[model samples]
Target: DNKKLRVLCEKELKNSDVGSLGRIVLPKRDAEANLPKLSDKEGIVVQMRDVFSMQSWSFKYKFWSNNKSRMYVLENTGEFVKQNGAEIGDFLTIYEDESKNLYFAMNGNSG
Candidate 1:
């Protein structure tokens, strides 16, 4: 049916690989200010859609301003945990609507 991308939020997988969230960590208090603001280090390029191998690519989503950061700077998604073999806590479910169009899901049912 296509649904049109709109799942809200979800983030688990502590040991699935991608620690400290340096390559991608989009969970600043679970959608702070409603998630949607890119500038600082300049990185908003996106394509993310891997709900367990449905397949998608080209990810960016950044925002680093020196004095205040960490959480919205997901640049190198670690290939979304090496092709969604995601384990550990298992969860990483992120989607966007209102035109954001980004998508992702691991342990979540959507995958």
Candidate 2:
């Protein structure tokens, strides 16, 4: 289709608050290949657009690497959750834009 954007992953929420902060983790498999790499202070940043609003937002994230595992977390997601009324067991669809920007929304709306 030559579209600038594509769906990456769809996951059911385990709990409305996953990160216990203003953050959400990418799927374990996609985390290493898709997430950013930067300093804990500097942070890897990307633009995220809302599907319904068509608004752009920045998500500052980083890879959390450990001895046995690694993962990625998108920060300041509380507003997104509150805005969308997302809850446990709700579906989340992740999308990547042409600029390689990543975003997520309920159902299939994202980027």
Candidate 3:
């Protein structure tokens, strides 16, 4: 649902005026700076673990900003389970957007 909404908004914005949408200003670094960062700190960490009767999934996504730290945890599932008549154990892939929102893709007959 979120992805659908984002796509719809992007499509609408494409047809709108660039100026009306606001200036394409760069992200601020510090109180007295207006230039882009010389080096950016954008990294992704993926880790998986199996603990007693449950599986754990964790990930961290980060972006660069000189003045403030910008990082987000995409997935932090401690005890994951599946419902219905499906298999007891299932594998899933998690996705993250530029804004650091997390989403999970499940395997099943229907969502």
Candidate 4:
């Protein structure tokens, strides 16, 4: 059982972009006030696969949270497009694909 677990975990890790980990850093703000509000010009479009892992692991991962992981600023242009009647910035949570393509989980609020 232990070996199986290890193998499963290893397989998962092998699929990840290991080199990209801890490499890209996002922009930072002092507080929620400092954080940029969602705007027509600025929005976040995480790959669909990334969103899934983010919901399952990244959000809970101690290393990826606010205090640990670096924050990068996303350009908000068509950043808030929705497919299949879905919207962006809604905050419902969804997943992206291996290539890091983003699917709309929630429609973002433009400030």
Candidate 5:
């Protein structure tokens, strides 16, 4: 069962992403390809697990309409970022199990 787990997406941290904003903007292509497609401004809530602490978190996955495009974002990530000690240039990777459960891991920059 564990072998069925796969990576959803991995994105580098941005200044605004790990700041007090409490949200992270996901890559448009990756979000569209792996995450559930949102049809409206109000998106869905996704439950995710922290790989390091094994804690559960609820994040709102939504998108902002940008003219003819969309900017996907994951909201309510402040605690996760703090606990993981994530900073700018760190990597945030999301994984998914066969059951479609989401997991998040933060890789700090050693340099």
Candidate 6:
């Protein structure tokens, strides 16, 4: 096991997540505990890396205002999904490196 990094969340990809929408719905519990806090309508930009390919990526880690509450999401994942060939059943394991940088490790269903 990799001891240098901390696991944030392991999420299974869905059709809506990997498609043209290019976003992943973050689990509420994990988002609250692991991600940067969204204080206002304009959220923070997150920098992430692909563990397998060692590619750097930038995503918008934001919250959508809905009625009384907000929903957490990671935007701009279209290229990420295609690069990893991720499917609906595939997995996306999120981790934080030693320097607090986010990393995305994919478990491709086709692989």
lDDT of each: 0.57, 0.60, 0.28, 0.24, 0.78, 0.74
Per-residue C-alpha lDDT of model 6 across residues 33-101, encoded as one tens digit per residue: 877678976778877666665566788888888789888888888888887777887877777777645
**Rank order (by lDDT, best first):** 5, 6, 2, 1, 3, 4
Clashes of each: 0, 0, 0, 27, 0, 0
If both were scored by TM-score, which would come out higher, candidate 3 or candidate 4? 3
lDDT of 3 at 31: 10
Could you tell me how far off, in angstroms, the CA of residue 44 lies in candidate 2 after the best superposition?
0.9
Error of 5 at 49 (Å): 1.0
Q: Given candidate 1, what's the lDDT at residue 61?
A: 68
TM-scores for every candidate against the unseen true structure: 0.27, 0.67, 0.22, 0.19, 0.83, 0.81
Task: Flag the better candidate by lDDT, 3 or 4.
Answer: 3
| Candidate 2 weakest ten by summed lDDT | 102-111
Error of 1 at 77 (Å): 14
Clashing residue pairs in candidate 1 are: none
Clash count for candidate 4 is: 27
Q: In candidate 4, what are the lDDT values of residues 1-111, reduced to their tens digit?
A: 011100000111111112223222222432112322333323433332222123221111111234543443322212122122223222222322223222322222211
lDDT of 2 by residue, 40-99 (tens): 644677766655556666766676766766656667777767677777766667667667
Off by over 4 Å in 5: 1-3, 99-111
**Among all candidates shown, the one with the greatest TM-score:** 5
**Which wins on TM-score, candidate 1 or candidate 3?**
1
Best by lDDT: 5
What is candidate 5's TM-score against the reference?
0.83
